[PDB]
Amino acid sequence: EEKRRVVYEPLELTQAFRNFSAGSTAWEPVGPGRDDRPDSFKLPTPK
């Protein structure tokens, strides 16, 4: 109001951002999967 214009100020939140990523799983969730490579693109094994 004193300056009659939109001013920029350091951020100050009334409620702070609560990051709930702290509760990520402690166990590996998916594993390795499987490979869908065609046999014509895998290196050959000797014998």
């Binding site: 709930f20 702290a22 509760g23 799983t25 166990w27 590996e28």
Partner: protein
């Protein structure tokens, strides 16, 4: 020696005789489990860890199958997956539908591994329903919801083997097998709080913390416990402005993976009886006041009292950090005083073990040194109370190898067999000249444990003299590969105080102070303060010390600042601030810097990096964190400090007594905690709930 085997195609080399699950863990293969734990005996009752080995026809328990040369292990066979699903299906059959109300929720292993290895749905819809289990009262610390027990026996294994509390066990048979005491008895041990972490499900739970938060909304900070002098590493879980709980984090050289009950449950004393605004005594009452008003009152008292030299006494309490001690000592020196005392009895005088060399007042054998012990003599100390995790360590050593323990001092309830040689200095003379002295002479890794409570006696010189003579004689106790001489501090701040020379001068102990500055300092009595003295208190809780003061200043607590603490080992550790101080409380060294400016002796540092520089100036081992380095002056120190100046001291005829009357309430925080108050009256010896017979 180390043998070789293959796990899921990989090549992993492991010591012979190890369990297959150790090999899997080393090789980066994840195996589910419940009953297995790294610090407990192997049980193999959960059957979750099954794997296939080509030699065996049926899948084998990985936690209990010993490794052998050339073994081939598959953890990913269709049979293995079907096995995990079957085991989980059976596990969840009688498990209660309690997740929204279980405190474990969000950090429950049953949840995570059911989600990762179990089926998406269930098959058990029986009109007869599930089994139910009575709830059992085992004290005010560990709340029980035994419907959730999956019978992993971790709690039993820990309570029996690790903490030596055999009241816990399993009664009944088959479906009706219940973990408990079979009758109303408290789980009475100072390590009880750890079954909370060990129980993978919510069956055993923190009672003062119950229902107050959920794991995903907690900010986790790694910091340092200050309840005892061991220096346990802890994780501080806080949300917003208050601290929720304290849980251990691994440091295999200090506390392993355990903390004692005080460190765990005295957190609730940090949100009550707090100091938030400066106070000024006016008549017989305190009145709130501004920081400027307080500090100006201190300055005016200083100019009016006009202390010369040692008339400005400074006392440091059990809980304060190194930076605050350094600030206080520097300011007091710049006032011309040398009267920087500690808070312990006889703390007006210098300690009898000396300050010149670190190895005179430290656990010279590291805490890990106890693992190698073959004989230990305890002098005037009860480790079960002074250092609980170290007591557990001594216990584990005693269980797994032969070991001879004897003690001189009050009859102590121990978790390990001890030999009592007497309560007196004469009994120590007899022992060190007797059979147990011979045992120490013959031992390969002997170590002598001296309690800090002996240092507080007037006759501490005689004890230190006898021990120093014995040490300087016996090479096994003190050679170039092993220092068996050990002082066991009880307060987290004593080691740091001695490290910076927070020790009164000889002439200082004679003077009667006109101004006293208490930093912490809640063990002070009415006697140690002159009536005419002007007393300043600086702390975080309201206790007897603040009751004695004329001006009170609020300072931050150990969870609210990033300080340095030096444990019994001489290890220097750094903490991290979880939250900010409440109210108008301030960081302690900043308080000292500002008041010194008002006193005209302005300290040369006004920034944390400059504080660490001053600390490096005082000692180079304060800035080297998590490091222990042995003394090259082992032989010089003993002669120069323990046997040298203690010749004249006359031993008293008074018997050695217990250093701490009540394990649960020893600090300002602990005396401000309702939980410790409840625990103290619940876990009293004369209460049948804590007897057995």
């Amino acid at each position: 020696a180390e043998i070789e085997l293959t796990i899921d195609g990989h090549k992993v080399s492991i010591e012979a005789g190890s369990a297959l699950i150790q090999a899997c863990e080393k090789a980066g293969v994840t195996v589910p489990r419940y009953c297995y734990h790294d610090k407990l005996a192997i049980a193999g009752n959960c059957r979750m860890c099954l794997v296939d080995v080509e030699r065996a026809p049926k899948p084998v328990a990985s936690c209990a199958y010993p490794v052998a040369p050339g073994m081939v292990v598959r953890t990913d066979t269709e049979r293995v997956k079907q096995a995990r699903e079957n085991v989980m299906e059976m596990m969840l059959q009688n498990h209660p539908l309690d997740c929204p109300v279980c405190d474990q929720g969000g950090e429950c292993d049953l949840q995570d591994q059911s989600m990762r290895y179990g089926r998406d749905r269930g098959r058990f819809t029986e009109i007869t329903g599930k089994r139910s289990t009575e709830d059992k009262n085992i004290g005010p610390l560990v709340k029980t919801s035994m419907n959730r027990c999956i019978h992993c026996t971790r709690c039993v294994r820990f309570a029996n083997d690790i903490a030596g509390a055999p009241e816990l066990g399993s009664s009944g048979r088959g479906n009706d097998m219940q973990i408990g005491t079979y009758l109303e008895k408290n789980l009475n041990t100072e390590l009880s709080g750890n079954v909370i972490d060990l129980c993978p499900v919510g069956a055993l739970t923190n009672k003062p913390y119950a229902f107050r938060a959920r794991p995903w909304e907690l900010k986790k900070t790694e910091s340092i416990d200050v309840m005892d002098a061991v220096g346990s590493n802890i994780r501080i879980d806080s949300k917003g402005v208050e601290v929720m709980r304290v849980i251990p984090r691994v440091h295999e050289d200090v506390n392993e993976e355990w903390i004692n009950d005080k460190s765990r449950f005295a957190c609730d004393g940090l949100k009550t009886q707090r100091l938030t605004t400066p106070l000024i005594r006016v008549g017989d009452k305190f009145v709130n006041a501004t920081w400027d008003d307080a500090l100006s009152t201190i300055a005016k008292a200083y100019q009016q009292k006009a202390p010369k030299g040692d008339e400005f006494k400074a006392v440091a309490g059990a809980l304060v950090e190194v930076e605050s001690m350094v600030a206080l000592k520097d300011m007091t020196n710049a006032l011309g005083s040398e009267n920087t005392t500690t808070d312990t009895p006889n703390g007006n005088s210098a300690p009898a073990h000396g300050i010149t060399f670190r190895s005179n007042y430290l656990f010279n054998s590291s805490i890990a040194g106890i693992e190698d012990a073959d004989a230990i003599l305890l002098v005037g100390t009860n480790p079960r109370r002074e250092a609980a995790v170290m007591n557990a360590r001594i216990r584990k050593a005693w269980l797994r190898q032969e070991l001879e323990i004897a003690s001189v001092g009050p009859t102590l309830d121990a978790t390990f067999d001890v030999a009592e040689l007497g309560n007196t200095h004469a009994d120590l003379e007899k022992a060190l000249s007797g059979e147990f002295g011979e045992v120490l002479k013959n031992a390969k890794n002997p170590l002598i444990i001296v309690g800090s409570g002996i240092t507080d006696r007037e006759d501490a010189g005689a004890f230190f003299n006898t021990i120093g003579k014995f040490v300087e004689s016996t090479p096994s106790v003190l050679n170039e590969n092993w220092n068996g001489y050990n002082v066991l501090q009880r307060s987290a701040s004593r080691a740091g105080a001695y490290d910076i020379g927070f020790t009164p001068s000889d002439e200082a102990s004679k003077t009667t102070p006109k101004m006293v500055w208490l930093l912490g300092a809640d063990e002070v009595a009415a006697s140690d303060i002159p009536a005419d003295a002007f007393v300043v208190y600086q702390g975080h809780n309201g206790d007897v010390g603040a009751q004695f003061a004329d001006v009170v200043l609020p300072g931050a607590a150990y969870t609210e600042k990033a300080g340095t603490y030096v444990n019994t080992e001489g290890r220097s550790q750094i903490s991290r601030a979880a939250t900010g101080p409440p109210g108008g409380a301030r960081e302690d060294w900043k308080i000292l810097r500002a008041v010194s400016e008002y006193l005209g002796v302005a300290l040369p540092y006004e920034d944390a990096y400059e504080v660490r520089d001053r600390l490096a100036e005082i000692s180079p081992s304060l800035v080297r964190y998590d490091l222990v380095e042995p003394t090259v002056f082992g032989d010089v120190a003993v002669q120069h400090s323990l046997v040298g100046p203690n010749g004249s001291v006359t031993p008293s005829s008074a018997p050695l007594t217990e250093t701490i009357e009540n394990f649960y309430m020893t600090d300002s925080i602990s005396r401000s905690s309702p939980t410790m108050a409840k625990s103290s009256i619940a876990f009293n010896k004369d209460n049948k709930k804590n007897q057995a017979f």
